[PDB]
Amino acid sequence: EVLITGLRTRAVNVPLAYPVHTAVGTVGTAPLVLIDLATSAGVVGHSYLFAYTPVALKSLKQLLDDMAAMIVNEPLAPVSLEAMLAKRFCLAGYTGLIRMAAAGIDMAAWDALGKVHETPLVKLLGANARPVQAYDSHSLDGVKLATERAVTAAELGFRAVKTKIGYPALDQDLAVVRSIRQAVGDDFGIMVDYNQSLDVPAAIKRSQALQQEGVTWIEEPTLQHDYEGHQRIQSKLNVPVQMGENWLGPEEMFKALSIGACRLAMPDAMKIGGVTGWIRASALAQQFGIPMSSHLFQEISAHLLAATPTAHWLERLDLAGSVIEPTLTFEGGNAVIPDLPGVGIIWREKEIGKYLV
């Protein structure tokens, strides 16, 4: 009785207070596609996608706009919508940009369904809202800024930070971790992210060194698709290997967990397949005994983790803050879901125009 009536997308390049430097390149602006899903019920679903590089930004918008005719006049039934897209793209390949587009549609449809029922997403999924501990996610910032941002994070009440490492020398990785540690004290989380930058022997050598220093987890040490190599790295470590942000669909998560690639998981609300894919990913993490965190998309991830049996950490990295009202808040380091229907996304319409492609 509630039909999808239209799809509107806006491609933006939004500024970042701090560029996200990684060992494999810098993300200085966030290329985003903002999504509005119109319905016959007088509500509009909102979601957005992260294109990672501006090279893929216009292609992703064009893809979504050409997909509108697939979903317009279909019922607002996101699980059924997802199965339809899966089958329609089964020859072309239901992965990559195509899967990311379907995930954006999925996330806007669930927002709209929450609005239809005038209830937050987390409650529509049958769970209570709860605060979720969050770590402040930084980047490959150099010892000076990394220590400064770590101190500010602790001052704002976060109990952990993530820095991105993979400097030319191991001693540079260690100097950054040591400087943060001396500034925050022992009772504080320091996660580190290599962004796929090491080969397997280098990952073992750097990770065992970092493990001696004291870190909370070691994230994507090597190529994301190399589940076997991640298993070999994890086999040489006590500290948990963490991965999952690049899993395109829960089927990729299933392959990785099946061979023991990691003791922690952090799906990406976009790449895992939206709310629908997240729910399936959480069922897997529960059965494999994997504490499950989020990657980006903090607005919807606060709802999703509240419904996740093995919920671990929320990643605070506010890529869309310049175009989304800050209804999501942080109290004592914990993300607090807003008392709003659906996801709680309200566009900053006066700001969006500044960034349109």
Ligand X SMILES: OB(O)c1ccccc1
- Footprint of ligand X on this chain (CB under 6 A)? 20, 22, 27, 91, 137, 193, 195, 245, 295-296, 315, 317
Window 172-191: residues binding its own copies (CB under 8 A): none
Decide: 274 and 243 in contact? Cβ < 8 Å.
no
Nearer to Mg ion, 276 or 294 (CB): 294
Residue 273 near its own copies by CB under 8 A:
no
Decide: 131 and 331 in contact? Cβ < 8 Å.
yes
Burial class (CB in 10 A: 0-12, 13-18, 19+), 120: buried
Nearer to ligand X, 39 or 294 (CB): 294
Which of the ranges 145-153, 222-230, 293-301, 316-324 carries the binding residues for its own copies, by CB under 8 A?
222-230
Window 161-220: residues binding Mg ion (CB under 5 A): 193, 219
Q: What are φ and ψ of residue 33, in 5° steps?
A: -115, 115
Closest distance to ligand X from the beta carbon of 310 (Å)? 19
193 is in an annotated binding site: yes
Closest distance to its own copies from the beta carbon of 329 (Å)? 20
228 is in an annotated binding site: no
Closest distance to ligand X from the beta carbon of 195 (Å)? 6
Nearer to its own copies, 225 or 348 (CB): 225
Residue 315 near Mg ion by CB under 5 A:
no
Closest distance to its own copies from the beta carbon of 174 (Å)? 14
Q: How many residues bind Mg ion (CB under 5 A)?
A: 3
Which of 6, 18, 28, 53 lies at the binding interface for its own copies (CB under 8 A)?
A: 53
> Measured between alpha carbons, how far is 215 from 242 in angstroms, rounded to an integer?
12
By beta carbon distance, the residue nearest Mg ion is: 193
Closest distance to ligand X from the beta carbon of 61 (Å)? 19
Among 164, 230, 271, 312, the one annotated catalytic: 164
Q: Give yes or no: 164 in active site.
A: yes
Closest distance to its own copies from the beta carbon of 149 (Å)? 21
> Measured between alpha carbons, how far is 332 from 313 in angstroms, rounded to an integer?
14
Among 271, 295, 303, 312, the one annotated catalytic: 295
Residue 126 near its own copies by CB under 8 A:
yes
Residue 83 near its own copies by CB under 8 A:
yes
With helix as H, strand as E and coil as C, how does the chain read?
A: CCEEEEEEEEEEEEEEEEEEEECCEEEEEEEEEEEEEEECCCCEEEEEEECCCHHHHHHHHHHHHHHHHHHCCCECCHHHHHHHHHHHCCCCCCCHHHHHHHHHHHHHHHHHHHHHCCCEHHHHCCCCCCCEEEEEECCCCHHHHHHHHHHHHHHCCCCEEEEECCCCCHHHHHHHHHHHHHHHCCCCEEEEECCCCCCHHHHHHHHHHHHHHCCCEEECCCCCCCHHHHHHHHHCCCCCEEECCCCCCHHHHHHHHHCCCCCEECCECCCCCHHHHHHHHHHHHHHHCCCECCECCHHHHHHHHHCCCCECCEEECCCCCCCECCCCEEECCEEECCCCCECCCCECHHHHHHHEC
State the binding string over 243-262 for its own copies (x if CB under 8 A, else -): ---x-x-xx--xx-------
Residue 79 near its own copies by CB under 8 A:
yes
Q: Give yes or no: 138 in active site.
A: no
251 is in an annotated binding site: no
Residue 213 near its own copies by CB under 8 A:
no
Which of 33, 34, 107, 113 lies at the binding interface for its own copies (CB under 8 A)?
A: 113
220 is in an annotated binding site: no
> Measured between alpha carbons, how far is 294 from 285 in angstroms, rounded to an integer?
12
- Which residues are at the interface with Mg ion (CB under 5 A)? 193, 219, 245
The catalytic residue positions are 164, 295
User: Binding site for Mg(2+), residues?
Assistant: 193, 219, 245
